[PDB]
């Protein structure tokens, strides 16, 4: 089975390569969810950016060998840490959009 602790949760924000620049550690963030709508806000901070784009560790070709090659803008995940006093009263769940 699985046990899912509901205390320490973060957010993974996928930004394009165009936006990754100008993002440093510790910058303020504001996160709004859909289950709670706009009636509740969240505060957080940048923890850091990842040294990989997801496609680094993929086990399969990104595109088919038979087909041609088409340019696709890449995305790079960013770790954002939430404040824990808001989760206890407005809890979240894994995989919700924001």
């Amino acid at each position: 089975m699985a046990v899912v602790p509901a205390t320490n949760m973060w957010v993974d924000a996928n930004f394009k390569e165009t936006q990754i620049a100008n993002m440093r550690i510790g910058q303020p963030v504001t996160i709004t969810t859909d289950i709670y709508g706009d009636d509740v806000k969240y505060t957080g901070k940048v923890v850091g950016l990842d040294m990989g784009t997801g496609s680094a560790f993929s086990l399969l070709p990104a595109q088919n060998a038979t087909g041609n090659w088409i340019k696709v803008v890449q995305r790079l995940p960013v770790r954002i840490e939430l404040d824990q006093k808001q989760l206890e009263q407005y809890p979240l769940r894994i995989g919700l959009s924001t």
Partner: protein, 50 residues
Amino acid sequence: RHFEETDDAYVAGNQIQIMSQVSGSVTKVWADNTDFVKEGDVLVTLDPTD
């Protein structure tokens, strides 16, 4: 601009796949989906015959 936005975000967390340290057969199951379990609680029990 001074801001950067993205709608490709998703909440993330930790998850543990409970696994046994030994082989055997099951005789009890102490929890089901959507059950609060504390650290140090028994979740499964095996036949101690072997």
